[PDB]
Design a protein around this ligand. Sequence first.
Ligand SMILES: [Cl-]
Length: 162
Amino acid sequence: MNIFEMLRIDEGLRLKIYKDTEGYYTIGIGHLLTKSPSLNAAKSELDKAIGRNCNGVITKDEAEKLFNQDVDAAVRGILRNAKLKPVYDSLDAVRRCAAINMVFQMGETGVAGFTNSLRMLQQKRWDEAAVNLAKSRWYNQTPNRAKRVITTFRTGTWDAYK
Ligand SMILES: [Cl-]
């Protein structure tokens, strides 16, 4: 397992514009296009992202390249953020994947509410961090996804994905 396989399992793959769990236009392996309600705005964002007139549909190769860009952007966002980088650097490789997964799903702004969880993770208080992470809108709205990610933080293994 690696971060790409983990997120592919969590996000799936769709080659036509779809709506995510919050209702936002998305494509590929969980690539958010726009929070605007306008399908035309989403189609415009898609064409800009891919570099051709897609009319709402992409190829598997295009989806995989977008996905690689999105994972890289999540990692770079962690490394540039003074609050997230020290926690990330304290984690082992499996738990670092769980961190990238959360940033991919919620962004740097969405993880900002997890200050107390981040401190527990940095202190390696895994069971306490797991309980704290579950006391969140995230867990209550996407519980199966959150359970897999939390189990990865709690155990440092891939067992939730196997
Ligand atoms: Cl879920």
